[PDB]
Amino acid sequence: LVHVASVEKGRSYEDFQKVYNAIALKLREDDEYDNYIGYGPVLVRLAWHISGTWDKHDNTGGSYGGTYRFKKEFNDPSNAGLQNGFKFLEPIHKEFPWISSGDLFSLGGVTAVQEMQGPKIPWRCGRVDTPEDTTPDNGRLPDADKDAGYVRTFFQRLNMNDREVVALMGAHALGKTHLKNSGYEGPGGAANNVFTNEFYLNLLNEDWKLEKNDANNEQWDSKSGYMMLPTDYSLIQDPKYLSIVKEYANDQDKFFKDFSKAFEKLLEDGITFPKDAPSPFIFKTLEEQGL
Numbered sequence: 001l002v003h004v005a006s007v008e009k010g011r012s013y014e015d016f017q018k019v020y021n022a023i024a025l026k027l028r029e030d031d032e033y034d035n036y037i038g039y040g041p042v043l044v045r046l047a048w049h050i051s052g053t054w055d056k057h058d059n060t061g062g063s064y065g066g067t068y069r070f071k072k073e074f075n076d077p078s079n080a081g082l083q084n085g086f087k088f089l090e091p092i093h094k095e096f097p098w099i100s101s102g103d104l105f106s107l108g109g110v111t112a113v114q115e116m117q118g119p120k121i122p123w124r125c126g127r128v129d130t131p132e133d134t135t136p137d138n139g140r141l142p143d144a145d146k147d148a149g150y151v152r153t154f155f156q157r158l159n160m161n162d163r164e165v166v167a168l169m170g171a172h173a174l175g176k177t178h179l180k181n182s183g184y185e186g187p188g189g190a191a192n193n194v195f196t197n198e199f200y201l202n203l204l205n206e207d208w209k210l211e212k213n214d215a216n217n218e219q220w221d222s223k224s225g226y227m228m229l230p231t232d233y234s235l236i237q238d239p240k241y242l243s244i245v246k247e248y249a250n251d252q253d254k255f256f257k258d259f260s261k262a263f264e265k266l267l268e269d270g271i272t273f274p275k276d277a278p279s280p281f282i283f284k285t286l287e288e289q290g291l
């Protein structure tokens, strides 16, 4: 399967910076969502789940085709709750009907991270919508109730290595688990709509307790009111993972730098970019624009 990036006709940096600003302006406006967390965390989760279907072996799935717009992927049990990120972006797609679905879903994730004061993420245009029959089947996204060997093995399919996996998981400092979506409940920290390395700090400094929640699932709970998933707590159980966790709890700039590279890589897996294709765009935030 080859997927070649095709820039939307005649579009350039300024067009996409207008779509960025639209998403970012609405993130500021619709602030009440999920008890004032706002839409940013569900939008970086949406960009990860449309990319997370990729399989390196046959180049199926991935962010290129925008296939989450089809019922099979929209109704995947693993995507429960992401309909709220879709409905947030649907106004902006009506306003810029020229951007492809893959591009709009991935740029929403980029925009949310930078607007929640994360690192800049280089983003590239050119994903092309593909037919309903190209939609990957349910079951390619990871279970939460498993251990470190499972996480390592699952992420080899998206060929991410240990460092990349641990840097990507730091995004679980954002938002929260919702019992009616996943059977897990609670936030992982106090700053859950500002991008920081707090996931790593909480994992190493809190007093975790294995408890059972109302959906009868086990999760790690702390006195402070935070929770960690079994696959999250996995990172301090494995010796290779645990020493990268310590590296990111001791250096927030290295965390930001490595997250930026692994999230772009995540969003680009499966796409062939021609050598005459434009460079990756670095978008300015509303704040750097005085907007």
Ligand code: HEM
Pocket (backbone or CB within 6 Å): 041, 042, 044, 045, 048, 080, 081, 142, 143, 144, 145, 151, 168, 169, 171, 172, 174, 175, 176, 177, 178, 179, 181, 182, 183, 184, 229, 231, 263
């Ligand atoms: C083995 C890996 C992973 C598993 C099992 C997993 C699982 C989960 C689960 C069960 C939730 C709760 C959903 C809900 O109830 O609403 C969640 C939320 C979230 N995850 Fe993951 N995740 C994984 C990796 C990642 C990665 C790599 C990213 C992003 C780079 C990510 C970003 C998020 C975000 C931002 C949320 C919060 C959503 C919200 O607030 O609504 N996840 N995760």
Ligand SMILES: Cc1sc[n+](C)c1C
Pocket (backbone or CB within 6 Å): 172, 173, 174, 175, 176, 177, 186, 187, 188, 189, 227, 228, 229, 232
């Ligand atoms: C959202 C998610 S998923 C796992 N944790 C810890 C949070 C905060």
